[PDB]
């Protein structure tokens, strides 16, 4: 019933402790994640990053917990009363340990995607994390909860000038994640971080990470 | 232990209505999805329609457009609204809490509905 | 249209047994929606299995849920004869049967 190890790039964000984001670990050092979480609240100290966690206030086992060595928002990152621009955000993460976590069952990276490469909309991927309901479940949901999003399209994008073409819209029917955690489009049968939710989850808009690859290198190197 | 009461369950008609009205007790109604399922005579079970806490409402394509799901959260009572009832809709109605996404956790004993002349 | 077939669709044999029904979507369904209702004959699908591999309280841990994507999975690891019951796939991504034709579970003795 601790489905990270399915999705186990997922990483948990909390405040300390609230649940303030998703992310994904694509490297051991580096979570990626939203921004628009963090620009309310911009301090690294302010954020415990969790990985290997399936639980929102439950500390499942295997679950790691660390510190934001480095928060890193996107200096453009710009909140429209709707869209976010830029909304990639980076998580060098310390564990109490003072180390970037390790390869488990239960916590991996998530491939980052090919250089600028993206699926066509209709793929298949997953938006991982407890996602904000209302109606009440019973996975309440502490359960960390992977969820199948067919990727739409940008025109297909219903808000007018967003497509920021460097955001991924997708969305499920019926409609789950978490802003700033993962959209896993398995790619080339590989599976990648394909976007960042950014708004939503009426589909969802991903930062599409193909294109933010540069600014990640630039800031996990 | 959150009971759940269908009812209302009866004969009716082809084309004809009827609304199974379903008590909420022991949980808190207002929270709760509440879902519709009916199981057949054949026993396919069938998800008749959701609605959500907030009264939003979902219909299965079996009976979406002549069937309203409806909630009253001051008297905490799911109601089903069937109209146009075809034979199909002959079946064991079924008051869920919960709803399709997050599975129905509890089930009312089910109400039973004959659509015949 | 992503059914979610379901095998067996009528299941047997005896108490202690292992035995697995399967959910078997295709077209892959996320597993935290997947749910697995059990309806004991003349009463109605209690909750079995949420989200795939969670049991709804007071089933007992003989059931245990597994499975991901397309592929899920009920499993009674020792089958008690109270188990004889239909056992439902359900999934919110399943159009436009949210259910599986079920397997019944016809214990042996």
């Known amino acids: 019933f601790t489905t990270i190890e399915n999705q186990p790039w997922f990483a948990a964000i909390y405040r300390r402790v609230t649940y303030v984001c998703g992310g994904s670990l694509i490297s051991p050092c580096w979570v990626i994640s939203a921004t628009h979480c963090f620009i309310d609240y911009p301090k690294k100290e302010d954020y415990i990053v969790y990985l290997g966690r399936s639980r929102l206030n439950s500390n499942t086992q295997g679950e790691m917990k660390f510190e934001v060595e480095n928060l890193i928002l996107h200096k453009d990152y710009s909140a429209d009363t709707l869209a976010h621009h830029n909304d990639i955000a980076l998580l060098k993460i310390r564990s109490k340990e003072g180390r970037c976590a390790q390869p488990s069952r239960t916590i991996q990276t998530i491939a980052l995607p090919s250089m600028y490469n993206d699926p066509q909309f209709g793929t298949s991927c997953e938006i991982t994390g407890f996602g904000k309901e209302q109606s009440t479940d019973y996975l309440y949901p502490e359960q960390l909860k992977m969820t199948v999003v067919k990727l739409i399209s940008h025109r297909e994008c219903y808000y007018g000038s967003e497509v920021t073409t460097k955001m991924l819209c997708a969305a499920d029917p019926q409609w789950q994640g978490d802003s700033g955690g993962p959209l896993v489009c398995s790619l080339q049968g590989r599976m990648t971080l394909t976007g960042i939710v950014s708004w939503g989850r009426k589909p969802g808009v991903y930062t599409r990470v193909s294109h933010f690859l540069p600014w990640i290198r630039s800031h996990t190197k | 232990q959150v009971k759940l009461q269908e009812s209302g369950g009866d004969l009716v008609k082809p084309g004809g209505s009827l609304k199974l009205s379903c008590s909420a007790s022991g949980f808190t109604f207002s929270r709760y999805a509440m879902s519709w399922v009916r199981q057949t005579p054949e026993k396919r079970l069938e998800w008749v329609a959701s609605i959500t806490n907030g009264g939003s409402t979902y219909y299965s394509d079996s009976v979406k457009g002549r069937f309203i799901i409806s909630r009253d959260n001051a008297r905490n009572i799911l109601s089903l609204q069937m109209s146009s009832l075809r034979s199909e809709d002959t079946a064991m109605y079924y008051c869920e809490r919960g709803e399709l996404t997050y599975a129905m956790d509890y089930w009312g004993q089910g109400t039973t509905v004959t659509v015949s002349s | 249209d992503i059914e979610l077939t379901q095998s067996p669709a009528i299941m047997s044999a005896s108490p202690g047994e292992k035995v697995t029904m399967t959910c078997r979507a295709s077209?892959?369904?996320?597993?935290?929606?997947l749910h697995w209702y059990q309806q004991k004959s003349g009463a109605s699908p209690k909750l079995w299995i949420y989200?795939?591999?969670n049991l709804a309280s007071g089933v007992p841990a003989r059931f245990s849920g597994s499975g991901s994507g397309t592929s899920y999975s009920l499993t009674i690891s020792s089958v008690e004869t109270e188990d004889a019951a239909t056992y439902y796939c359900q999934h919110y991504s399943a159009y436009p049967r949210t259910f599986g034709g079920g397997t019944k579970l016809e214990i042996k003795r």
């Open positions: 077209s892959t369904v996320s597993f935290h929606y």
């Open positions: 989200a795939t591999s």
